[PDB]
C-alpha cells in the first residue's frame, strides 16, 4: 500500500531521473 | 531497478494520487 | 505547489510509462 | 511532454513525498 510505494520512490526515483535524461540525449 | 520503479508508476502511483486528492478535500 | 504536480502526473504519467517501456525494449 | 513530467519528478515529487509522510503521521 502507500508505505512500500513511498519507499520505492525515495530510493528508486533518483536513478530513474538519470536514466531518462540519458535516454533523451540519445 | 527501473523495473521496480516502473511497476509502482503503473499501479501504486495512481492509487496514491487518489489518496492525496481525498486528503486535500479533508 | 501540490495541485499543479498532481495535474502534471495525471495527464503526463501514462505517456511517460509508454515511453519508458519502449526505451527498455530498445 | 516528457520534458514537463520530468521536471516535476525532479522538483515537485520530492516535496509531495514529504507532504504525504506528514499527513500519514497525523
The gap between the terminal CA atoms of chain A, to the nearest Å, is: 35
Residue A1: strand, helix, or coil: coil
- Rounded Cα gap, residues B21 and A25, in angstroms: 35
Looking up cell 520512490 gives A9
User: By the CB < 8 Å criterion, does A26 face chain D?
Assistant: no
Cβ atoms of residues D23 and B23 within 8 Å: yes
Write the DSSP symbol of residue D20. Answer: H
Say how far apart CA A10 and CA A23 lie, in whole Å: 21
| Structure resolution, Å | 2.0
- Structure determined by: X-ray
Q: Which chains touch B (3 or more CB pairs under 8 A)?
A: A, C, D
Which subunits have 3 or more CB–CB pairs within 8 Å of chain C?
B, D
Query: How far, in Å, are A5, A18, C19, D11 from residue D22 at the CA level?
Result: 15, 27, 32, 18
Strand boundaries in chain B, DSSP class E: none
Closest CA to C19 of A5, D4, A9: D4
Mind spelling out the 3-state secondary structure of A5-19?
A: HHHHHHHHHHHHHHH
Q: Is D8:C8 a contact under the CB 8 Å cutoff?
A: yes
Amino acid at each position: 500500500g502507500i508505505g512500500a510505494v513511498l519507499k520505492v520512490l525515495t530510493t528508486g526515483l533518483p536513478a530513474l531521473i538519470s536514466w531518462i535524461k540519458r535516454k533523451r540525449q540519445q
